[PDB]
Structures are given as C-alpha cells and as structure tokens.
Amino acid sequence: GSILSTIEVASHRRLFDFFARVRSDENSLY
Amino acid sequence: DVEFDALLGSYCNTLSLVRFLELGLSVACVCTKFPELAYMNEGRVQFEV
Amino acid sequence: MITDCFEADIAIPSGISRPDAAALQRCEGRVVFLPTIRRQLALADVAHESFVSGGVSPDTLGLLLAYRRRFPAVITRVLPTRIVACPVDLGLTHAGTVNLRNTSPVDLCNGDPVSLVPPVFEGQATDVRLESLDLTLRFPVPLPTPLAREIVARLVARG
C-alpha cells in the first residue's frame, strides 16, 4: 500500500546565450 | 672472428579498464545522465517528505 | 589563438544568486589583474582578497604597486559558467582589437595611450560586490595619460 512519487528536478538553462550574447533582466526567469 | 648482439625479448603491460559498475561501490550511486548539464546554473531536487 | 588570442578562463562557482549573477553581465569592458597566465583561474584569485596581504589591504597609492607585479587583462565575454579574458601583453584577439569601457568621468580621444588607474576619484569608487560569495572587484579606471601622470603626482605629493 506504499505510495511512490517521482522525484522532481528543477533547473533552468539558457542554451541560446552560448549561441549569442544576452542581457536579461534580473527579476525575469529566462 | 664473429660476434653479435641480441634482444631476448620485449615485455609489455596491459592497462585494466575498470567499469564503475563493476565496483561494488555503485550501490551507493544512482547513475543518471544529463544529456545537457553545462547549460544548467542552479538546479534543485524536490521530493515529498 | 595561443599567440593570437589567449583564453584565460576565470571559472564561476555554483552558488551565485541570480541578482548577483546578472550583476556580472554588466562587467563587459573591464580590467582584471591576472597574477599568472594560467588557462584556468578562479574569482578568488581575481578578487580583492587575492590582492590583500597578511592583515593589510593597502591604500590606493599602494594599490598601484602590485598591479605592475601582475598581468592586466580585459574581459571578453561573460558566460554563465565562466569569464574569458585575453591578457594584454601576449595577444589581443584574432584580429587584435578588444573593447574596453569608460568607467572614467573623462572623455577619451583617438590615438591617445590609455593608462589604467585605481578608483581614486570622488563618487567613483564603485566595486561590484558579490553578496552570494563575499567578494569585491575593484575595477580600475582607464584614463588619459595627461591626467594619469598628474593623478599619481598628486598622491605622491600628498604623502
């Protein structure tokens, strides 16, 4: 009767920054 | 008059390739791959307790 | 690209807050005093805590005196994981042209040599501080040489 919950990995990446220079606002989440 | 020199043979060594899985220590891991990590800045892990 | 560029790579650590990390995106045209020409360095070797001696961080007149024991380099691009600077003495870029940024209050001209000076001016000593790491970055001031000799001259005469 055990309950299994999938682990959640939270991470954010900015792959395009490597392709090009960027100057994103600090508050906003890219 | 006849003389010579000789090589009585060469000896090599064999590196041993070690899979981390073969170690008993892999019991502590859980080995999962990011196809992409380097992009990540700050990742978190989240689970219910 | 060893002789043309030289990508000395300042690594960025893992734990930096996004307000502190996005504060480095405005650190484009700067001057970084590399102690050596290693291809992999850390911010602690760049920041002012590398500059400090035993117990004593010197004054602005002494802050010159270990610039010239080091290697000035200019940040080329601020990636999220690293900061790349080419040293001035070895090789500038592919084409040999890098961009600075006037942190001076002074306008430049073409062809004039540019000396870099510690932050001596009033309302000017702006050190970008890493709150997530407790590190300060004393960014020097690029100045015209008809000023940069007099500014040293006022400090030496004051002592």
Short mmCIF file of N, CA and C in Angstrom, two decimals, chain B residues 2-35:
data_model
loop_
_atom_site.label_atom_id
_atom_site.label_comp_id
_atom_site.label_asym_id
_atom_site.label_seq_id
_atom_site.Cartn_x
_atom_site.Cartn_y
_atom_site.Cartn_z
N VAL B 2 83.83 -13.72 -35.20
CA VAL B 2 82.41 -13.50 -35.38
C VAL B 2 81.80 -13.19 -34.02
N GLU B 3 81.06 -12.10 -33.93
CA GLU B 3 80.36 -11.70 -32.72
C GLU B 3 79.01 -11.11 -33.09
N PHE B 4 78.15 -10.94 -32.10
CA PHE B 4 76.85 -10.35 -32.37
C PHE B 4 76.26 -9.84 -31.07
N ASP B 5 75.10 -9.20 -31.19
CA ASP B 5 74.32 -8.80 -30.04
C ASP B 5 72.92 -9.37 -30.16
N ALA B 6 72.10 -9.11 -29.16
CA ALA B 6 70.82 -9.80 -29.17
C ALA B 6 69.79 -9.06 -28.36
N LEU B 7 68.53 -9.35 -28.66
CA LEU B 7 67.41 -8.97 -27.81
C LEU B 7 66.69 -10.23 -27.40
N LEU B 8 66.59 -10.44 -26.11
CA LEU B 8 66.00 -11.64 -25.58
C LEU B 8 64.52 -11.43 -25.30
N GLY B 9 64.00 -10.34 -25.84
CA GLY B 9 62.57 -10.15 -25.95
C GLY B 9 62.01 -9.02 -25.13
N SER B 10 60.88 -8.51 -25.59
CA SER B 10 60.27 -7.31 -25.05
C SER B 10 59.05 -7.71 -24.25
N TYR B 11 58.75 -6.94 -23.22
CA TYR B 11 57.62 -7.20 -22.35
C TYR B 11 56.76 -5.96 -22.25
N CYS B 12 55.47 -6.13 -22.50
CA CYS B 12 54.54 -5.02 -22.43
C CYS B 12 53.65 -5.24 -21.22
N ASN B 13 52.82 -4.26 -20.96
CA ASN B 13 51.88 -4.28 -19.86
C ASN B 13 50.51 -4.01 -20.42
N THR B 14 49.49 -4.43 -19.69
CA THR B 14 48.11 -4.26 -20.13
C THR B 14 47.36 -3.42 -19.11
N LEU B 15 46.98 -2.22 -19.49
CA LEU B 15 46.06 -1.45 -18.67
C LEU B 15 44.79 -2.25 -18.45
N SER B 16 44.21 -2.10 -17.27
CA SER B 16 42.96 -2.77 -16.95
C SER B 16 41.84 -1.75 -16.96
N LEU B 17 40.92 -1.86 -17.90
CA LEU B 17 39.80 -0.93 -17.96
C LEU B 17 38.83 -1.32 -16.87
N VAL B 18 38.42 -0.34 -16.07
CA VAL B 18 37.58 -0.57 -14.91
C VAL B 18 36.26 0.13 -15.11
N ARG B 19 35.19 -0.64 -15.25
CA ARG B 19 33.87 -0.05 -15.25
C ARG B 19 33.45 0.26 -13.83
N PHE B 20 32.93 1.47 -13.63
CA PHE B 20 32.47 1.84 -12.31
C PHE B 20 31.37 0.92 -11.82
N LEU B 21 30.57 0.40 -12.74
CA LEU B 21 29.52 -0.53 -12.35
C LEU B 21 30.08 -1.80 -11.77
N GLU B 22 31.20 -2.28 -12.29
CA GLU B 22 31.81 -3.49 -11.78
C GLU B 22 32.16 -3.36 -10.31
N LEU B 23 32.54 -2.18 -9.87
CA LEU B 23 32.78 -1.96 -8.46
C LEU B 23 31.52 -2.23 -7.66
N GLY B 24 31.70 -2.81 -6.48
CA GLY B 24 30.59 -2.91 -5.58
C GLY B 24 30.12 -1.58 -5.04
N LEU B 25 30.92 -0.53 -5.22
CA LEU B 25 30.55 0.75 -4.67
C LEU B 25 29.38 1.38 -5.41
N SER B 26 29.05 0.90 -6.59
CA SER B 26 27.96 1.54 -7.32
C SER B 26 26.69 1.41 -6.65
N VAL B 27 26.64 0.65 -5.57
CA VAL B 27 25.41 0.52 -4.82
C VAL B 27 25.00 1.85 -4.25
N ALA B 28 25.94 2.69 -3.86
CA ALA B 28 25.53 3.97 -3.34
C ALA B 28 25.07 4.94 -4.42
N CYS B 29 25.48 4.78 -5.66
CA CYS B 29 25.06 5.73 -6.68
C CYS B 29 23.61 5.51 -7.05
N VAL B 30 23.11 6.44 -7.84
CA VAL B 30 22.08 6.19 -8.84
C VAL B 30 22.56 6.98 -10.05
N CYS B 31 22.92 6.29 -11.11
CA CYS B 31 23.69 6.96 -12.15
C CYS B 31 22.74 7.33 -13.28
N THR B 32 22.45 8.62 -13.40
CA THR B 32 21.64 9.13 -14.49
C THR B 32 22.35 10.29 -15.15
N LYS B 33 22.17 10.38 -16.46
CA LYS B 33 22.93 11.32 -17.26
C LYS B 33 22.06 12.49 -17.71
N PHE B 34 22.53 13.68 -17.43
CA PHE B 34 22.16 14.84 -18.23
C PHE B 34 22.76 14.77 -19.61
N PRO B 35 21.95 14.63 -20.66
CA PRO B 35 22.46 14.97 -21.98
C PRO B 35 22.96 16.39 -22.00
#
